[PDB]
Each structure stands twice: as structure tokens, then as C-alpha cells.
Paper text:
The DendFP from Dendronephthya sp is a member of the Kaede-like group of photoconvertible fluorescent proteins. This FP is irreversibly converted from a green to red fluorescent state following irradiation with light from the UV region of the spectrum. The excitation/emission maxima of the green and red state of DendFP are 492/508 and 555/575 nm, respectively. The spectroscopic analysis showed that Fe2+, Fe3+, and Cu2+ significantly reduced the fluorescence emission of DendFP.
Thus, we focused on determining the native crystal structure of DendFP to investigate its metal-binding sites via comparison with those of previously reported quenchable metal-bound FPs. The DendFP crystal belongs to the orthorhombic space group P212121, with a = 115.826 Å, b = 124.737 Å, and c = 129.059 Å. The final model of DendFP was refined to a 2.60 Å resolution, with Rwork and Rfree of 23.42 and 28.13%, respectively. DendFP possesses a typical β-barrel fold, similar to other GFP-like fluorescent proteins. The chromophore of DendFP consisted of the tripeptide His62-Try63-Gly64 located inside the β-barrel and showed a nearly planar conformation with a cis-configuration. There are eight DendFP molecules in the asymmetric unit, which represent two tetrameric DendFP. In each tetrameric formation of DendFP, the two dimer molecules are related by a non-crystallographic two-fold pseudosymmetry axis perpendicular to the β-barrel. In its tetrameric formation, metal ions cannot access the interface of each molecule, which represents a site where metals cannot bind to DendFP. Following the superimposition of the crystal structures of DendFP and Dronpa, the metal-binding sites His194, His210, and His212 of Dronpa were structurally identical to Arg194, Tyr210, and His212 of DendFP, respectively. The metal-binding sites of the DendFP crystal structure were compared to those of iq-mEmerald, and Dronpa. DendFP is considered to be involved in metal binding via other types of amino acids, unlike the previously described metal-binding modes of FPs, which utilize two histidines.
Author numbering:
A (entry chain C), B (entry chain D), C (entry chain A), D (entry chain B): 3 to 61, 65 to 223
Amino acid sequence: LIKEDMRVKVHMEGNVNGHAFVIEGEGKGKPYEGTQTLNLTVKEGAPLPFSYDILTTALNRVFTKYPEDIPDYFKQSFPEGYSWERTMTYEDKGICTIRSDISLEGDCFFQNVRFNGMNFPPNGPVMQKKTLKWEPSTEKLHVRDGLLVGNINMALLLEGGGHYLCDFKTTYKAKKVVQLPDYHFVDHRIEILSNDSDYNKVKLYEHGVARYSPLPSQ
Amino acid sequence: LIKEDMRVKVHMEGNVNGHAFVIEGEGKGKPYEGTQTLNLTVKEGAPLPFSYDILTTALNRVFTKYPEDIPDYFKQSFPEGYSWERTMTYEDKGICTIRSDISLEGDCFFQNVRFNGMNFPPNGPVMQKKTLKWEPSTEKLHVRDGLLVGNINMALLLEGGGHYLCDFKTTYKAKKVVQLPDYHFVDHRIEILSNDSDYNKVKLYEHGVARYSPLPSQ
Amino acid sequence: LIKEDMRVKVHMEGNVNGHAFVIEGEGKGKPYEGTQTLNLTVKEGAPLPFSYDILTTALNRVFTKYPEDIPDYFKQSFPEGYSWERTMTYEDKGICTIRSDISLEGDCFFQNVRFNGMNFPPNGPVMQKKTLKWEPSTEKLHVRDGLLVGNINMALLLEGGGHYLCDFKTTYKAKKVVQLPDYHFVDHRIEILSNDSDYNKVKLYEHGVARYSPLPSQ
Amino acid sequence: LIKEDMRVKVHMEGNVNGHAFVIEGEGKGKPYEGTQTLNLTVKEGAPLPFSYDILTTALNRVFTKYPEDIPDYFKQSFPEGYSWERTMTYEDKGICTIRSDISLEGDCFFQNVRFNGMNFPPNGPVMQKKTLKWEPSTEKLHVRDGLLVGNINMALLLEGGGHYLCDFKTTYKAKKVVQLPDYHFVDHRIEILSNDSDYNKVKLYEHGVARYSPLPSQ
């Protein structure tokens, strides 16, 4: 069962372009409002030689405000929970493969993540740390082989203006049989609120809202 | 100048998996409300042996409702007008390349379209006409090298359920200096209203509304 | 019937990055040795404002040396002949879509080609005529849905050294049911032998040989 | 220094579709003939719930027959050794991300491999163990930014005929400055010689020979 208030614990082990790191996060959030706050410490491989932004979207879709007219795959999936696998394909041919396991114990979700980035241009914006933020997005989700699949045309705002684009592919896998939703959208905004200079401590925010098209069928 | 009521003429010369066609349209629209309808006659290639859906997004973003806080790339471009180039990339590895030129004489927008589609599996949804409709969508639009570029995750709803995915990339090119918008989103719904069973005659409708994130910054 | 010696006529209508063109071609070759020569005249849109190398591979696998034990898809297809569709995807996101209809009247093959290119960066290798030649190549051919399909990792050698890569995908389609080959390979070399400085007049040569792996199976 | 006979030790940590595994290889090979064998034992995660064939090509290019006219990038890298990064991108949108380190102690090459596979369809041929073998291949190698890069059009033969395509991209990184080869080819054949039906015990063979085009220039 999910309360209007909930706690989040995150562990991430990763390698990006040969560099190894660990990240731990203590957080809270409001699942039914689609909002969450997360306090992240770089535990190993400080200082990071790449943009913290690439990591943020691997740092739960339980925290999405779902209209009643659209079945909530992620919330239904508990107490057993769900896992997801993501492919982040950037335009400079940098690739990240990410796997998260989402388990519940009491007031606290536990997020267990594996981050693999490689083939990022060394003089490119991720390894040169020129990303300011992710642009807010719209995930498209549908059913493929009894699973939920999300697709997002994503964009990072660069220092000096312009965008660096990433194609976002997630397969969400519930551990119990759940009621499948039809083709819907989720509006996101991912925001780093505070950080230190090495991004050794970061505070992260996420707002997610499930919807149908606002435009009338005919 | 663009009135509240404007007329639309459309010429399409096209080729899908070897088959050559010409489709003529007469239509009308409300540019500032972001809605329009088009009456489509197949002049050559009747009957068509592939889903009409693949042609529909090619059959003018002037018919996009633009809020005052976002500059309108498409309306500013007139009187000289604009052009666009598009790649549609399907999951079965069918592919379309499209080029459109948008002129304005008096109240009428003329659209000249060259449509190419190939490597569509012959037992694939498109050549078997097993596509019911396009899902509603959300195009993300950024400025790259002074031009406006859109990316859309798109899905066709098939018989038996299931969706058939496509990656939309558009490059829009004003034939004039115009004020350039910040990163923004256009929500879309395209639908076929009426058709004979050969789709030789089709009535097409589109609704398009531009916006920033509905979710607020923190 | 295909003789040791045959003639080749070539009509290509095209458009690259907005620039239209027409290229006529009379030529000859030895089908059973997989060698041929072609004399190429630019007839419209001279001089071409882009590298001629993109076009050359679109200017007939009938000129392939086929060992006894691999069926010859192309040669079998005649008299009725065959057609092909090709995708050229360049690493800088230039994209060419090409169709060729291959017919036989007497001892002369007619090749009717439609060539479409778009999204070549204006400062890019293709639009800045900075390519020397195609590296020789190995095509891989497999049967998919009762058609023959080819994939080639191709490279254009650049002025100043280094390579500009391009993923090659051809779908060949005989107009007759022919005996389908097993998975096999075609070794390629294509060469511009002679040209004037605007490439308005080009002499083109290709050598193609089909084989299995030379490596013994354990 | 490499001798006509050398030994191989392999430690692969891996996760495919969430299922983790460890494999230990002991094997031998003949570096200047391009031939090698391996004895593979699944030490964790037996039985593997996916096709073994996807793991086989990550289980040295030191064991490649290199002519004198083509510099040997991999044999020059020792005594210090080389690392490699690979992308395997399947047509069903399955993806593997691999990384290897090659060390030499005495007469034995130590290969340390990390394997990540994900978004493999659950009814797909990988997850349904329906892959008979890798077809023989021809890799194409060029220098990009003072590193050697490999591209292969790879196919798995499918039980019930037909093929399952993969795009291989490998970036090899010598840990010492070496002589850089010109654009060349390496012909490959990988073959599982013997296996228990669960594949917990597997014997592996690979042949690899470097060449130029066998077709004369003009």
C-alpha cells in the first residue's frame, strides 16, 4: 500500500567512459501528486569527470500523478514491485545502458541501479560538463508483449545555448500481473535544485503527470 | 496577412515500394485555432495498395494555435512563407523522406509535396493496410543553426490492438528572418473523418496547439 | 540470355540538398566476370554542387562473378528483370534513398534510377566535394520474406586522410520466382577511372565477386 | 612477446535482461594463424535463460593472422596490452554493451569482460534460445582519432530458417603508442564446437585473418 507521503532510498553503481562511481540517495516524495525530492552523495570516484545530468533520470514512475481514467501500472505493481531497463542514445553517438530494480519495505522504496555509459566524445558536452539542465519532456507509453514501454525525445540545454538531443527508451516490467493502461503520455520536469561544484552532493526534484491528449477526438 | 479563416490547396506526387501516385486536396482551416480539414482525391495510382495513414502527416504548421508568450515560426514566415524536409523512420525499417513547399496567394495556402517511401516489409502493416489510425502525439521543437527542428515519437494503432512505432524528424526553413522561439512543444491529433473503402476520396482533420511544460519550475 | 559481353544504358533523375539533375550513361561489361565500365554525362544541373561519389554506387549486380554453388538471384531474374531499393545512411545524418528498375532489350541492360539526398551538412564532406573514393567493400546477403537484402559497412576516403562512414541497405526484388541463395558475400571495388574537373563527364568501373567465407568450418 | 602457442584465461561478469551470470574460460590458441579454442563454464546463474551465441564474440584480436603489408595494432600493444569497447545493436532493438581489458602474464592472455544486454524481446529469438550460429563475418577497420574502430554486419542463423541481424561497432584502445594500420578487413568465423544442452559447459572456436581487397585497383 502507498501513502500520500513516502520515503526513497537509492543505490547506483556505474562506469562511464572507463570511470567507476557509486552514488547513494536518501529522499521523500508525494506519489499521488507525482512529485519527489532526493539527496544524493557521490560515495566513490569523486570528483566525477562527466555531466551529473546524464545520471539524473536513472535517479521511480510510482511518483507520477495518474488520472483515474488511466490505469497506474507502477503503483498497481507493489508490493512485489517492478524493474526497468533503459537505452539513452545521444546524437554524438554516446550510449548509456541503465537497469533499475524498485522494491518496497514499509514507508521506503529501494531503487537499485546499474549505469553503463560509453562512446561519448571526450571533447563533447557530457565529458566537458557543458549541460545546464534537461528540458521538460513528454514520455509516450504503450503496451508491447504484456509490458509497458516508454519513448522520449529528450534534450539537454547547453551552456552557450542550443540543445544536445537523446532518444529515451525504457521497458517497465511489473513483478505481478497488473491492469495494463492504453496508449498515454506523461509530462515530466527533472530539476537539480542545489549542488556543490564537484556535484558530490546533489538535491534532485521530479514532477510527473500522466494524461491523454488535451485535444478532442472527432 | 493570415485571417481567422483561410483556404488550403494541396498537390502530392509520391512513390511507396515502387508504386507512383498523385493526390490533390482542397481544404479550409482556422490558423489561430490550430484546426483544419482537407478533401483528398487520388488523381493517379488508384487504388493505393498501402495504408493511407503513412501519407496523412505529410498532407502546414501555420494551422497551430500559438500562445502570445511563444513566437510563431510558421505565421511570421509569411508572406514569403517556408519549406520543410522530413524523415519518418519505422520500427520494421520502412522509411519515408518528404519535402513540402508552403506558398500563400490571397486566402489560399498551396502545399507542394514530394513523398518517397521504401523498404516497407510486404507482409508488414503498411502494405497489408492493417493501420487503423495515428495515436495523438507531442512534437518537441528546438532551434538548430537558425532553423526550427521537431522530433515526435509516433505510433500507428493496428488491428488486434498493438502499436507500430515511427521516429519523426522535421527541419522547417523560413524564407525570411523571423523571431526564433525558445524550446517548446506542439500537441497533435490527426484523424481520417470520412473515406470510401479504396480511400480514393478521404477527408482529413488536424488539431495542433503549441505550449511550454504544464509542470512548473522549482 | 546473358552473354560474356553485354551493353548498359543508364538514366538517372535526382535531387540532392535541393539541387535537381539528370545523368545519362552508355557502357559495357562482362557479367560472368563481375566487371563493367560506364560513360556518364551530366545532362541537367551542371556543374553538380556535391561529391559525385554518393551517386556512383547507384550507377547492376548482374555484373557479379557467381560461383557455380551459389545461385545467381540477379541473372536468374531475366528476361523479366529485377528492381532494387536502397537506403544510404551517412554518419553526419545525410540520407540518400535510391530506386533502380533493371530491364533487358537484346544485349543492353537499361537502368532507370531515381536518386534522393537530403540533410547533408552544408559544410559537410558531401556538399564541400572533399571525398576521394569509396574503399573496396564486402556486402552480406540474406533472404528476408522471399526477397534478397544486402548490408555493407561502406567508407568514403577523405581529403586529409580519415574516413566518412555510411550504412548501406539494399532490397533486391526479381519480377520472377528465382531459386533463392544461402547467406553469402560479394567483394566490391568501385572506381572513377577518369573525369573532367566538374565531373560533367565520368568513366566509372566496378569489380564485384560473390563468395562464401574463405575460412574452413569445424 | 607473443609466441606461436599461447594460453587464454577469461572472466566474464554479465547481466542480460536482468539475469546476472559469471563465466570462466580456460583456452589455448595460435596467434599468427588467427585460430583459438576456449573451455567455458557458467560459474554463476546457470542455466542461462538466453541464447549463448550473443556472448561468444566477447569471448582478443591478437589471435588474428596479420600480413606483413598490414601493421598489427593488437600484437604491437603488448607488453602493456589493449582495452576494447563494443556496441551490438540487434534489429529487434535488443542491445549489448561490452568492455574488455587484455593483459599478458607469461604465456597466458588474461581477458577481463563485462557484458550488459537489455530490451531483448521476451518472445524474441535471444530470450527463446532459437539462434543456431553466427554466420561467418568480414569486419572493416579504420582509424578514428588515433584509435582503431571496427564495423561488422553480423547475422545469427535462426532455427526455422532466416536471419537475425546485429550491427557490431568495436573501438580498440592500445595502452601504448603503436604503428596505425591503413583501412583493411578481417574475415571471421566463430563456431560453438561442443556444448551441454544448458550451455553450462561450452567449447568455442574462432578463426580470423586480416587482408586487403583481393580485387585489383586500376
